Ligand binder design. Sequence first.
Ligand code: NA
Length: 176
Amino acid sequence: SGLVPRGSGKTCPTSEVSPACYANQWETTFPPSDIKITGATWVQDNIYDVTLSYEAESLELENLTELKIIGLNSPTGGTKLVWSLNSKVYDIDNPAKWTTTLRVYTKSSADDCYVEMYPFQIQVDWCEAGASTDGCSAWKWPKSYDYDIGCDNMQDGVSRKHHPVYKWPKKCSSNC
Ligand code: NA
């Protein structure tokens, strides 16, 4: 009885979530960052829910105008906001380190035991449009910039992106 559902996901082995490509060099513009997927769950067909982890050198939360994922290939929208003064979304405590859930479309990876998500960007905007300007004049970097995530735009082992996208087993299976 207890094992039968009442009507009409699989989490991926964490060790099997890893980068979908490697390179000798990656783009090094903007503050240093560490951006990766840390878990995946199969929803249905080519749709998964993933945990994106972000760490980067930053200003303070009060300086932050907007922080969002853009260009996302997803059934629930091309944009996910993590912080937006203008749209009133307040989902993180610290801009330097946070996770977020993303629902994403996938495609078959080179090794077809795995699937991978599509390229996307993380746009960061500081010190404008109602954000505090305190400490913004000591900031060495631009006030607005984008981390580019992808396994595309790679020539002879050099990527023009900041970080790879991630792959994980198809259906979050344990076969791989
Ligand atoms: Na948080």
